[PDB]
Amino acid sequence: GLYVGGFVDVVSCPKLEQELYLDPDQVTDYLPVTEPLPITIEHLPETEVGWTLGLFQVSHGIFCTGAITSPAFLELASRLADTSHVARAPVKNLPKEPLLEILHTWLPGLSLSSIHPRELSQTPSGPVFQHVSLCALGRRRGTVAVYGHDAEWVVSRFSSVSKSERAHILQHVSSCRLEDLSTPNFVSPLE
Ligand SMILES: COc1ccc(Nc2cc(C(=O)O)ccc2NC(=O)c2cccc(CC3CCCCC3)n2)cc1
Ligand SMILES: COc1ccc(Nc2cc(C(=O)O)ccc2NC(=O)c2cccc(CC3CCCCC3)n2)cc1
């Protein structure tokens, strides 16, 4: 299993409009998120690859850490990172950690899916957030996602996240029993 970490765009995934990007201040009252949310690809519910391990308001935005736990996803991505010329083409030559480099460049955006802001003000009936997605398109804010084998290393890549903020994030990550999370539903698109 891998960890992912990054700042999210906050998005409502509207049916009619093409996209709505929320100001983070519109949702910070519902933070932190300390229960697992599905992590999917490009907001597709049949592409669960793992589970969030916390969403926290820090000084420079809303930071998410997550676990990529899907066996079919990790095995496929790991095989492509070692053998696929296409996957490696946008990456620097001969990376020490090809799987981490490939995810970093192909899935650089984290997006947090929220209810519409009209609901956000206020007293929503049920959960404010539906999922976090790894995205290839549609990034607005700065910073990109970091993938790694150890959460502390992932979070400490972000120079804009302070030592106190990182310790707070890492406390929540450590309190999560990875074994207890159900298997995400990702299926290998080759099957
Ligand atoms: C782990 O490997 C994969 C391979 C393909 C998919 N999805 C997919 C599906 C189907 C299908 O259904 O027909 C067709 C195309 C697919 N994927 C893309 O066009 C694409 C574009 C940008 C980023 C990614 C994420 C992936 C890229 C490779 C490194 C691991 C991360 N995928 C998802 C995961
Ligand atoms: C839906 O069916 C498929 C077919 C092939 C793959 N991927 C794959 C496989 C194998 C294999 O097996 O050895 C080797 C390389 C593969 N693909 C990638 O490394 C890669 C990386 C980034 C994005 C994509 C999307 C890809 C899908 C549509 C054509 C254009 C670009 N693919 C993924 C899904």
Domain boundaries, the chain: 1-191
- My answer on whether omega of the bond before 122 falls inside 30° of 0, hence cis, is yes
Q: Is the Cα dihedral 45, 47, 53, 57 positive or negative?
A: negative
Mutate to test the pocket of ligand 2, among 84, 91, 102 (most ligand atoms within 8 A of CB): 84
**Ligand 1 contact, 76 CB (< 6 A):** yes
**Secondary structure (DSSP) of 111-154:** EEEE--HHHHSS--SS-SEEEEEEESS---SS---EEESSHHHH
Interval between CA 18 and ligand 2 midpoint (Å): 27
60 is annotated as an active-site residue: no
Structural determination approach: X-ray
DSSP symbol at 64 = E
Cα(74) to centroid of ligand 1, in Å?
12
Among all chains, which residue has been given the structure tokens 């420079």? Answer: 60
The backbone torsions φ and ψ at residue 120, rounded to the nearest 5 degrees and listed phi first, read -70, -10
Report which DSSP code applies to 42. T
Structure tokens at 169: 């994030």
CATH level 3 topology of 1-191: Serine Protease, Human Cytomegalovirus Protease; Chain A (3.20.16)
Catalytic residue among 43, 60, 168, 172: 43
Label residue 169 left, alpha or beta by phi (over 0 means left) and psi (-120 to 50 means alpha): alpha
